[PDB]
Amino acid sequence: SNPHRWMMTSPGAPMVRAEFEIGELSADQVVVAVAGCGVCHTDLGYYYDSVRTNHALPLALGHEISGRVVQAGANAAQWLGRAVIVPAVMPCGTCELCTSGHGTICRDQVMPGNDIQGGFASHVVVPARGLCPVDEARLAAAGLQLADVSVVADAVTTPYQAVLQAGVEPGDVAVVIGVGGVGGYAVQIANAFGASVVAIDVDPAKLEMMSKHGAALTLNAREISGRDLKKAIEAHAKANGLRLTRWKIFECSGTGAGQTSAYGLLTHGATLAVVGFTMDKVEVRLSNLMAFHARALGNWGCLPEYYPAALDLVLDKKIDLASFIERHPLDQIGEVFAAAHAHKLTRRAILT
Amino acid sequence: SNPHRWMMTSPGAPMVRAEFEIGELSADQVVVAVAGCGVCHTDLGYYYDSVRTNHALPLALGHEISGRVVQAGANAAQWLGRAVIVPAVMPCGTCELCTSGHGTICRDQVMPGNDIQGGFASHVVVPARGLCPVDEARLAAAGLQLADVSVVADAVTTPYQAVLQAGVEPGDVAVVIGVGGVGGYAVQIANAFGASVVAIDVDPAKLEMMSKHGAALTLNAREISGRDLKKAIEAHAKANGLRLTRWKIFECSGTGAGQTSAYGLLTHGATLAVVGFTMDKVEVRLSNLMAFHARALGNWGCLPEYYPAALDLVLDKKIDLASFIERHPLDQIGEVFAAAHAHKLTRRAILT
Ligand SMILES: NC(=O)c1ccc[n+]([C@@H]2O[C@H](COP(=O)([O-])OP(=O)(O)OC[C@H]3O[C@@H](n4cnc5c(N)ncnc54)[C@H](O)[C@@H]3O)[C@@H](O)[C@H]2O)c1
Ligand SMILES: NC(=O)c1ccc[n+]([C@@H]2O[C@H](COP(=O)([O-])OP(=O)(O)OC[C@H]3O[C@@H](n4cnc5c(N)ncnc54)[C@H](O)[C@@H]3O)[C@@H](O)[C@H]2O)c1
Ligand SMILES: [Zn+2]
Ligand SMILES: [Zn+2]
Ligand SMILES: [Zn+2]
Ligand SMILES: [Zn+2]
């Protein structure tokens, strides 16, 4: 009957169950009663690789949040009782960058489980700006609980922004390199947008898995090299009457190998969507961009305003969550983090 | 009294004066009586560096053509007597690529002085599709001869496409790296679009020159290093109340050094316009594109449909040709090529 969180006090140290009181809410704030919260490589980063959080410790992690607004500041009453997905990163909505369509670079953006207390908790206080309403009627009809669509935040929306930006359209070849986590939904969403998707990875189990979920062709990056990789996608395109131009290539590995591979796949009018982050440098013919009249598009998370469309893909069964999602009790946060670090998990963990 | 061309028979061999007959014209064809034709590094490439032309030798080079329609096929009568700029490269206008706004990668694009006989000639036969009409009243009022606007093709239009694509708008910092040829017009057009333009080069004469023609700041890349170069543009932006985000960086050097420098200048929301071509590979943190939500845009020449706007910049004196342009008699084609190879020219050569 008291709200509680599971907080990181220190990298590698045990998570601490800490009860708390919700205070006065500012005018634009709401309390969401967490249904579920996803476990991300970003979260494992903070905890196992000592990546600095913006908020000082102790801090409840978790940015992949669904739940219900149970409490609201003065200008947020309209949200009470509505089931929501919380945006993983929330722009101001009011500054010249936000208002000119550059929300992804708001100097005042807030990420639960980094900037503020996160969603590994019964309850989490968040701004009401960009909350994504969930139709529970449609949720039920898709055979899903509110906790399941928690991972729509970041895991679905991030690749959704990448694909929208890239302008995937029917007849396209799409290539996604690294087809775990973000990448897997990159394949599913590219496919929903009309592309014939080539999936590339080092793990033949994720390749096998994506065969059933929108990957019309799969290639192991350990087996097939650069020169052959181009020929094999050219082959796929020719054999299926698909575009030899305007390839939509999503780099979702976050490794220099992946980036080098993806850049090598550029052709006339191609879009390379850079989604994965590495500090590794890469050797590339930058001028190929001019030679092919191609573009490389970075993507920093996703504007909230696209969350409802990403959700509609799930609700209208145009993609699958359920096969990539496993609910766990929040009190297992310790065992789950350990399991996910040791790559012993195949589905994305949701804590309840 | 016979039409003639100056043809490349063989790389490095003398140019040959060859007279010719214009036959019956197909329905969409016109003869333009050349007023002037620009001499480009592309032309020096074909002649001095043995770059393959698509049309077999012997071939009249020259793709930077202005002149007058003196003769027209049956469906092109309306063009007779009209002063024109010939597009350096003419897409089909009928293919899925041309019809979906990807004309720059049409596979059936025709370039005078490469695919067909060029403009180092009294006369050149070209399609009527994409011809840019020249207002002679406005031409006169800008203090220009028809021969002067020959270099609007490629030299102006190429950077014009790069700037339009990059979405330069008032409040922007623009950086152009390599401020000769294409680069110089990149500075002039960025500036006309409302940016405060930083010019970067290794030649202090072109820097001095661009100070007078839209470069609000100049930096010698031999004197100022990478780290300091960023600080100095940050300084320019802070001191002038300019955007510290969404920088429009145009790489116009066609050298790995320039590319490495330009990529290093990326910031939140930045556009890197890749205009220069080198075969050199470069080492870059590709993920900076995701971290800054930035984009790299290649540019292969320019859609004809934008030639009128490029010309309007010249006619309305919003940019300067005259200070960068020198007419020569076509019969000097030999002496001029030699002079331009030996870097002995400061203005762009037009042959008459
Ligand atoms: N752009 C954003 O806003 C954003 C948000 C979340 C994730 N990311 C980044 O995306 C990257 C991956 O995200 P994730 O959580 O899905 O990771 P993940 O570990 O779940 O998936 C990465 C996949 O890449 C595969 N892989 C590794 N090396 C490869 C190679 N050379 N070729 C092909 N596949 C290869 C792995 O086997 C794995 O399936 C990270 O760098 C992460 O930080 C960025
Ligand atoms: N994208 C297209 O469609 C298109 C069309 C025309 C030209 N180009 C390319 O544009 C490039 C330049 O053509 P141009 O006629 O303008 O060449 P240019 O020789 O007239 O100009 C190049 C400029 O780069 C400067 N420079 C050289 N090294 C530099 C460095 N490290 N840092 C900064 N500046 C440096 C030079 O001093 C010079 O001013 C070439 O690579 C050419 O092939 C492409
Ligand atoms: Zn996440
Ligand atoms: Zn904002
Ligand atoms: Zn040219
Ligand atoms: Zn065409």
Residue numbers in the entry:
A (entry chain B), B (entry chain A): 3 to 354
What does the paper say about this structure?
In this context, we determined the X‐ray crystallographic structure of the wild type (WT) ThaADH in complex with NADH, refined to a resolution of 2.60 Å, as well as of the double mutant K319A/K320A without cofactor, refined to 1.80 Å. In order to shed further light on structural features, the crystal structure of ThaADH was solved in two forms: First, the WT enzyme in complex with NADH, which had 3 molecules in the asymmetric unit (asu), comprising one‐and‐a‐half dimers, and was refined to a resolution of 2.60 Å. The quality of the model was good in monomers A and B but electron density was poorer for monomer C leading to some unmodelled side chains and higher B factors for this molecule. Analysis of the wild‐type structure using PISA supports the experimental data in suggesting a dimer as the majority oligomeric species in solution. Analysis using PISA suggested that the dimer interface of ThaADH has a salt bridge more than in CPCR2 (PDB 4 C4O) as a less stable related ADH. Residues coordinating the catalytic zinc in ThaADH are C42, H65, D156 and E66, but superposing ThaADH and CPCR2 structure suggests that the catalytic zinc of ThaADH is in a resting state as already described for CPCR2. For this reason, molecular docking of substrate molecules into the active site of ThaADH was omitted in this study, and 1,2‐cyclohexanedione was placed manually in the active site. To approximate a productive substrate binding, the maximum distance between the C4 atom of the nicotinamide ring of NADH and the carbonyl carbon of the carbonyl function (<3.2 Å) as well as the distance between the terminal carbonyl oxygen of substrate and the side chain of T44 as proton donor (<3 Å) were taken into account. Thus 1,2‐cyclohexanedione was placed in the active site of ThaADH with 3.0 Å and 2.7 Å distance between the atoms mentioned above, respectively. However, due to the manual placement of the substrate molecule without considering the catalytic zinc, the following models should be treated with caution.
